[PDB]
């Protein structure tokens, strides 16, 4: 009861900062998005294709077994 | 106030044998030389 009153009362003061709309314009002015994670993909359709990064490839172990 | 000693017998032995007179002893020398230079 006291906590949910004091948190909202502090939010009223902290949210009421000056200007408050130029930063909306600053954030929305960069309509190019944040840069997204790179994957190897095909040129025509963009399905992922397998990678040979050393820090992942150094953990891999395979073996050979006879067939039936 | 103000030296490398070598062995007579081993030097004679290793000078006595020859590689390079044919491909067989040459290839034996190549294989040994690769592994010996490694380890």
């Amino acid at each position: 009861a006291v906590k949910v009153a004091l948190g909202v009362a502090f939010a009223f003061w902290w949210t009421s900062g000056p200007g408050a709309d130029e930063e909306m314009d600053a954030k929305a002015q960069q309509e190019p998005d944040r840069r997204s994670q790179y994957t190897r993909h095909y040129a025509f359709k963009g399905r992922g294709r397998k990678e040979f990064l050393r820090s992942d490839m150094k953990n891999d172990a395979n073996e050979l077994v006879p067939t039936r | 106030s103000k030296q490398f000693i070598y062995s007579k017998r081993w030097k004679s032995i290793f000078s006595k044998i020859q590689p390079l007179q044919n491909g067989t002893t040459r290839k034996s020398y190549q294989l040994f030389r690769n592994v010996a230079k490694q380890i």
Binding site: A43, F44, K45, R47, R49, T67 | -
Partner: protein
């Protein structure tokens, strides 16, 4: 439609299959359309002492309208390992892309 993806195993034949799905499927059906095949081997070995690691991957989607065919292959060749030398390995990769009737050219 869950009774269509419950099937008997076959256990093992060498290759692996996965189904490939699109982002917007049809409304009253399952969205998967294509099949990706994967194969992996080590051909020129004598008694389990192998030669030429090799693998291959093909995605195929075929219907009466379009055709998608992607493929990738890798071949690894080992020249020396220690103590016979240093570790010296070359690798050859090939890939191809066919997408009909959108593009009418193929990519190598």
């Amino acid at each position: 439609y869950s009774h269509r993806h419950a099937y008997a195993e076959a256990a093992d034949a060498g290759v692996t299959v996965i189904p490939s799905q699109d982002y917007y499927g049809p409304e009253h059906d399952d969205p998967l359309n294509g099949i990706v095949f994967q194969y992996e081997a080590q051909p020129f070995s004598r008694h389990g002492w192998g030669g030429v690691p090799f693998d291959l991957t093909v995605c195929c989607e075929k219907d009466k309208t379009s055709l998608c065919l992607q493929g990738e292959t890798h071949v690894s060749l080992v020249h020396s390992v220690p103590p016979f030398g240093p570790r010296h390995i070359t690798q050859v990769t090939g890939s191809w892309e066919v997408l009909r009737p959108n593009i009418k050219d193929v990519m190598y």
